Amino acid sequence: RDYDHLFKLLIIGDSGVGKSSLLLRFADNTFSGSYITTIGVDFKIRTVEINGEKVKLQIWDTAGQERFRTITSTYYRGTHGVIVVYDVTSAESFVNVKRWLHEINQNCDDVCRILVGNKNDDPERKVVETEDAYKFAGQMGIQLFETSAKENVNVEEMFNCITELVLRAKKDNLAK
Amino acid sequence: GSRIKQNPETTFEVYVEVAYDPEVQRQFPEDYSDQEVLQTLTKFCFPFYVDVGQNFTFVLTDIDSKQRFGFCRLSSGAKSCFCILSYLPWFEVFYKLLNILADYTTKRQENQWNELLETLHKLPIPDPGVSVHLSVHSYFTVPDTRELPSIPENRNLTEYFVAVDVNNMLHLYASMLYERRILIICSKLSTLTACIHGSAAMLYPMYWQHVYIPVLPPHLLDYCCAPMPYLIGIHLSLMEKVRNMALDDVVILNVDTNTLETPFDDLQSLPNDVISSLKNRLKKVSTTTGDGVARAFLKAQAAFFGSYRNALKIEPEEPITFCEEAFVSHYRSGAMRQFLQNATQLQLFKQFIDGRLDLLNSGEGFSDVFEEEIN
């Protein structure tokens, strides 16, 4: 109706990495509460105008993803792009997203994806160093964003990137 | 891979009486302070548009995707609802308890009401078979959830089997094995949530791993647009709203009319020998009495997934792994070749395997009916 493009996004990451806090920065929703602990799923909406094109994004999250050592390809059906989040202060959160990103590479290579290291706002507690995440990002051919949802640093840039990726994918595929 | 809480702290979290925006009239514990949960309960207790049945069980999912059961008892004309929220999947026990508490409430027996709830809330959770008294002359035995559900003892399976014809049971099963988005619609809430619980239970030893909402209240209708796999029940009064969403690639079962819409060829694509054998068992009286229905689906699951054992690479120096290439490259039909490859993409199969791998590499030592059925 009131937009030129609608895209469906997923955010994935262990519980506690700051996905809901990222989505709060993301959202246009009047009600900001989350239904993760109600029905085990939550969605938020953002509309943005990029070079004159009205773009609407849905982003969906689900509960307890840390129990999935691998998230399999049925999860990603119908989704245009994925925001893959770890916590820079949690080694275990990073090992999970690496498995997830290999599975996407092998079984859902058509989906746009970016890697996000959240909670990048306390050097003393940082465990996943930039170099190692950046190296992994390069190997997988994807971009890395280290963010602080808490301080609202590099969040907008991170969202702009996945938004622009899915927009480009739509245009590239429209062109044959 | 179960989403049942294995070590609940109490027999239940909170009990509420809700009446007509609906409000909590009464609660236990008296000092229960989660106003977010209380508010949520008021909406899930009346998950339909006003203008059926008595019992039904909704599920709230928590942050690690474990399940809280909202066992409900609806008043005569949907004027009020009695609900107990618990991690224990004891449908028959809590429906009974609700009846007792409702009659105490009716007869204004405040002391018996308080005593029953307090005694229950303080009770350390007992082992299966232990006697728990409702009264002096009445007791239930703690259920053994490791057993297959039996008809008519198990309310969910019994109501599911009564309401849904065999072809539609097969279509639901097939859709789950492809991890479709599945919507069940019914005018009776008891029937609605029984169909969701009962059908998901047929996946045993696997469990539905993604969105699971036995009944969805209208204020959350937009969640039918979720793109990940889901299993969602809605009351018939919400159907027009859903019809409006023009959902693409969703399996929809109208239970009232036993009409199933699916854009996929899932049931026909499954290995025909397995499905024939299942269908035939389901059609006989002799093999559908007692635990017959659950046994039939268990045998199908064993026939579909049983070869996983031969893909367990057990090379010393640790640890036991699952070899997918081995799994998908040994088959007794072209249809199974395709099935096994599809199975590697299923979250319900992934959680089953990773759970086995953990359990095996632990050295725990176990048994269940699935493994017996494989043997």
Ligand SMILES: Nc1nc2c(ncn2[C@@H]2O[C@H](COP(=O)(O)OP(=O)(O)O)[C@@H](O)[C@H]2O)c(=O)[nH]1
């Ligand atoms: N220090 C810091 N804390 C954060 C950040 N983002 C979220 N948190 C905190 O981490 C906790 C979990 O975040 P939440 O959004 O609820 O996690 P979720 O389970 O992934 O959705 C909350 O207490 C947040 O305030 C961040 O960028 N920096």
